[PDB]
């Protein structure tokens, strides 16, 4: 509180959005909270608590934005823009990692953590369950299948590394978990091959024959069928 100048809410919104264009947020949120303190009854309060969340999404802290959006839920649980806030949550929880110093355009995204990925999956499930028809339906399902593919790929990388060490008795349970609760993924016809190789290396002839029958009935054409599975790299 250093200028404390009377202004117009529309001009304040214009200044805040052009500051967002020019990456000025610390004063924008301070230009946001002042209008809410002086003029409480305004949708600009919600617009502020959402675009300062987007700003903290460009920045590092998250607890402030999450606390603000939960306080909003506690005060105004019936605003129509809630979905966007929800999306913003799914945004701020996803951790796009906007940083050019370590760009790495590949960015497999399967290295952040299982915690945030699983929490974003739960959040997006709550999203699709709450509003079946919002301003965003295709992008939500797209990023959802992307993150579940990333989780499956993380599990696949764990299983692959464990196979590089010889833990067949452990890769067995890992592959069982993958084949039992990680369907519809792309890392299927390779994990099955690792399970078959492990069963062959563990002297399980009947189990190997059975799992190979499942192989030929579930994947009739795959390069892993001709060439036995070999740990890459």
């Amino acid at each position: 509180a250093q200028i404390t100048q009377d202004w117009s809410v529309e001009k304040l919104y214009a200044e805040a959005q052009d500051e967002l264009n020019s990456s000025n947020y610390t004063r924008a949120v301070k230009l946001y909270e002042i209008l809410e303190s002086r003029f409480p009854t305004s949708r600009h309060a919600r617009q502020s608590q959402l675009d300062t969340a987007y700003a903290y999404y460009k920045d590092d802290e998250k607890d402030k934005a999450l606390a603000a959006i939960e306080r909003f839920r506690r005060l105004h649980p019936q605003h129509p823009n809630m979905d966007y806030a929800l999306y913003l949550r799914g945004l701020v929880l996803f951790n796009e990692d906007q940083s050019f110093l370590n760009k790495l355009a590949s960015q497999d995204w399967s290295d952040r953590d299982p915690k945030a990925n699983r929490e974003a999956y739960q959040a997006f499930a709550e999203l699709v369950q709450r509003f079946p028809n919002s301003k965003y339906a295709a992008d939500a399902t797209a990023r959802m299948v992307k993150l579940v593919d990333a989780l499956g790929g993380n599990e696949m990388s764990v299983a692959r590394y464990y196979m590089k060490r010889g833990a067949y008795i452990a890769a067995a349970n890992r592959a069982k978990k993958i084949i039992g609760s990680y369907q519809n993924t792309r890392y299927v016809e390779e994990s099955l091959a690792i399970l078959e190789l492990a069963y062959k290396k563990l002297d399980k002839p009947q189990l190997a024959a059975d799992t190979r029958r499942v192989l030929e009935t579930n994947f009739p054409k795959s390069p892993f069928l001709t060439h036995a599975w070999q740990p890459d790299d």
């Binding site: 303190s37 409480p40 005060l75 649980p77 299982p114 590394y161 060490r165 833990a167 349970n173």
Partner: protein, 771 residues
């Protein structure tokens, strides 16, 4: 019955009647007689909405005359002296009081109570807390914090009751609390703290317990203030139990898989020394680590003392009750951002689906913390809903940045300014793949280098990498006129590390290098022979260009408890610079390393150091090139004479003194470390005193020179630079300033058995790294 038709609340400002429509447990068209007359009160009183709501029922428009919760707009912060205003602001935000945060007076009372009690925990007792509550705009409130702090809380006398077994003074010398004197005024080293007092209490418990006195019945503690609440006095009353003789420990219990004989052997104890309770805790720890490495994490060990008086002894029966052998089902990892999952799974033991052994878990913990990528790591063990033999080992990390650019400067006694710049990275936004560009430059040294390493080449691990360096050195510089020659080396090298065991890791290396060494104006005798045998003369100068294909063997172990401020442990190793044949200048040199430590006292620590190395000649080259010889004497070598001033000294044109150096170096060191008790234990300075000899030898004898011999004896046997078992006596003290801006070592040395040819250096100062 009653049907609700748009029940109105009146006496509001911003409550948004739709929001309260949602919040009331009823809605439009609902019957309410008296049910939620107080339930709504509890709901809106919770979640921070209102504090005084009058609920009425009249004409369908209920008069809810509410005084809205005041808003903490801007917290006024001042009067904080020892603690920071941002700190109190953050730890108050921890309790709420965020933006407008529906302020409550009871929360203010709770906060002021918390701060006053936490300050009473400190040396501030008489706190006139006056948080000024002022009515700002419509609902804004500013809470002003005012802490009227006392001077301090120092102790006048520290005495106990029944103080017959030990002297008061020596008892004060062991506790972590002193009284006011001349070495306590600075840094307020006499403040009183609750946690520090409890720590001193448990410390004196361990003191009386290790000495052989049992059960240490502490009667009471009495604190007393003075007038105006400025000074503090402490009184203690305790009770001892006398010494004993504990010799009959025993163990009993089921040992399904581990043999009892092993547990009895690990139970190190004897009827002598009458006991050691620290050893009791140690044997509990070792029996929990061993019995529990077979796969029994929940081994509960019970201990009950059996005291037999008259003879004044106590025995210890250990009724261990293990069972339900624990396997491992799965192990997760959390907080692994910016890092691959495999770079963490590649280090720890306890693969999977195996019995759970803490012996491997602690090794995995030390291995992962030895990586440096993370700050804090924990090893949780949560059971699963399939609790027979199935548990879970979810992980947790605290990430730390790895790559950075270093731009450091340092100052040495003779050369002066030295610079070291460069970029380094331990994780190139992927796996480890550590690489670094580093260039150091002084008035006499130039060292550029690019390096790139990968700890894991194979599946287990090989430190595979490349490196191209730009070594250059020329000491023809200011007053210190070391033998004049400019050398510059470059080229590459394969350096392969290979762990032989879980602890140690040897590393070999081959390298193809090019070298250009150019001398200067007319050189001593040992240079013309080289430039006419292998080098190339050019008028009154000499130069040489070629290849120096060389290898390096290394093996170094270090187990000190801390990098800085060392303790029990020892840095040792072996190294070998063997210029592999195939190119010119076929030579080799070996070295050793031994820096044993000994903390034989709580304050004074000693060290037994010493290194040994030989630089042999082989193949075509029979002599030793000067530009790769050793320079005896210096700071780290003898802590005495000037650097590179050992060995013989030969006169050159215009009467300058040059030293050749030998092919057999050795040194042994010994000092005594104790800190300075002036202000406090601030980690800034360390004092010691060394008394160490040297070693430098030539083997041949020197009689011919530039018409003048710099030695007393006309035929001084240069087999040793001195009498047999080459060495030079000296000693002296050494202070070290260990501020984070590099070490500043100031050594004041006095020579011993001073021969009339050894130039002395009484005071040496080194600032920074100067590596």
């Amino acid at each position: 019955d009653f049907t609700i038709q748009d029940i109105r609340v009146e006496g509001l400002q911003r409550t948004e009647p739709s929001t309260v429509f949602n919040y009331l447990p009823v809605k439009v068209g609902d019957t309410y007689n008296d049910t939620h007359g107080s339930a709504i009160i509890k709901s809106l009183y919770a979640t921070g909405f209102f504090d005084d709501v009058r609920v009425e029922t009249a004409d369908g428009q209920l008069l809810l005359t509410v005084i809205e919760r005041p808003t903490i707009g801007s917290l006024n912060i001042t009067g904080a002296k020892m603690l920071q205003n941002d700190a109190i602001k953050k730890n108050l935000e921890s309790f709420g009081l965020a933006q407008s945060q529906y302020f409550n007076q009871a929360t203010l009372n709770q906060a002021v109570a918390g701060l006053k009690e936490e300050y009473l925990g400190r040396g501030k007792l008489n706190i006139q807390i006056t948080p000024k509550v002022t009515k700002l705009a419509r609902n804004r409130v500013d809470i002003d914090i005012t802490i009227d702090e006392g001077k301090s809380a120092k102790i006048t006398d520290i005495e106990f009751e029944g103080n017959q077994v030990y002297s008061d003074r020596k008892l004060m010398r062991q506790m972590s609390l002193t009284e006011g004197g001349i070495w306590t005024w600075l840094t307020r080293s006499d403040r009183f703290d609750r946690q520090k007092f409890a720590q001193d209490m448990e410390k004196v418990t361990d003191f009386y317990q290790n000495n052989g006195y049992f059960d240490f019945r502490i009667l009471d503690t009495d604190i007393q203030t003075n007038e105006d609440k400025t000074r503090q006095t402490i009184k203690i009353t305790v009770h001892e139990g006398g010494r004993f003789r504990w010799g009959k420990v025993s163990i009993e219990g089921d040992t399904n898989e581990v043999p009892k004989a092993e547990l009895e052997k690990l139970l190190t104890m004897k009827p002598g020394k009458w006991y050691e309770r620290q050893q009791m805790t140690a044997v509990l720890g070792e029996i929990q680590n061993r019995m529990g490495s077979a796969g029994y994490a929940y081994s509960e060990i019970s201990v009950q003392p059996l005291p037999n008086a008259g003879t004044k002894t106590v025995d210890f029966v250990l009724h261990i009750e293990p069972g339900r052998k624990i396997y491992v089902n799965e192990i997760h990892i959390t907080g692994n951002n910016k890092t691959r999952d495999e770079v963490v799974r590649r280090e720890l033991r306890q693969m999977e689906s195996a019995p759970y052994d803490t012996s491997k878990l602690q090794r995995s913990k030390e291995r992962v913390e030895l990586l440096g990528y993370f700050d804090n790591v924990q090893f949780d063990a949560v059971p699963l809903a399939g609790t027979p033999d199935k548990v879970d080992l979810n992980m947790s990390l605290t990430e730390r940045s790895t790559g950075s650019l270093d731009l450091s400067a340092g100052w040495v006694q003779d050369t002066g300014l030295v610079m070291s710049a460069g970029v380094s990275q331990d994780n190139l936004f992927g796996t480890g793949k550590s690489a670094a560009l580093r260039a150091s430059r002084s008035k006499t040294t130039l060292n550029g280098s690019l390096s790139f390493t990968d700890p894991y080449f194979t599946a287990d691990g090989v430190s595979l990498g490349y490196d191209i360096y730009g070594k250059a050195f020329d000491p023809r510089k200011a007053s210190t006129s070391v033998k004049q020659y400019k050398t510059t080396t470059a080229g590459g090298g394969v350096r392969m590390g290979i762990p032989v065991t879980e602890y140690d890791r040897v590393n070999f290396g081959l390298a193809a290098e090019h070298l250009t060494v150019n001398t200067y104006n007319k050189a001593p005798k040992r240079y013309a022979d080289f430039i006419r045998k292998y080098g190339k003369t050019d008028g009154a100068d000499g130069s040489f260009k070629g290849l120096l294909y060389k290898g390096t063997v290394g093996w170094g172990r270090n187990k000190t408890d801390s990098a800085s401020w060392p303790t029990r442990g020892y840095l040792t190793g072996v190294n070998a610079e063997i210029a592999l044949p195939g190119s010119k200048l076929q030579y080799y040199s070996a070295t050793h390393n031994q820096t044993w430590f000994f903390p034989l006292s709580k304050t004074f620590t000693l060290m037994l150091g010493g290194e040994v190395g030989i630089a042999g000649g082989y193949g075509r080259t029979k002599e030793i090139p000067f530009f790769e010889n050793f320079y005896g004497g210096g700071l780290g070598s003898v802590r005495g004479y000037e650097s590179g001033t050992l060995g013989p000294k030969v006169y050159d044109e215009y009467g300058e003194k040059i030293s050749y150096g030998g092919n057999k170096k050795a040194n042994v060191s010994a000092e005594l470390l104790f800190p300075m008790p002036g202000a406090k234990d601030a980690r800034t300075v360390r004092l010691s005193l060394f008394a160490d000899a040297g070693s430098v030898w030539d083997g041949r004898t020197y009689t011919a020179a530039e018409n003048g011999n710099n030695k007393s004896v006309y035929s001084e046997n240069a087999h040793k630079s001195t009498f047999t078992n080459e060495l030079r006596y000296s000693a002296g003290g050494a202070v070290t300033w260990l501020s984070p801006l590099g070490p500043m070592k100031f050594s004041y040395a006095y020579p011993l058995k001073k021969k009339p040819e050894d130039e002395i250096q009484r005071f040496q100062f080194q600032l920074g790294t100067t590596f």
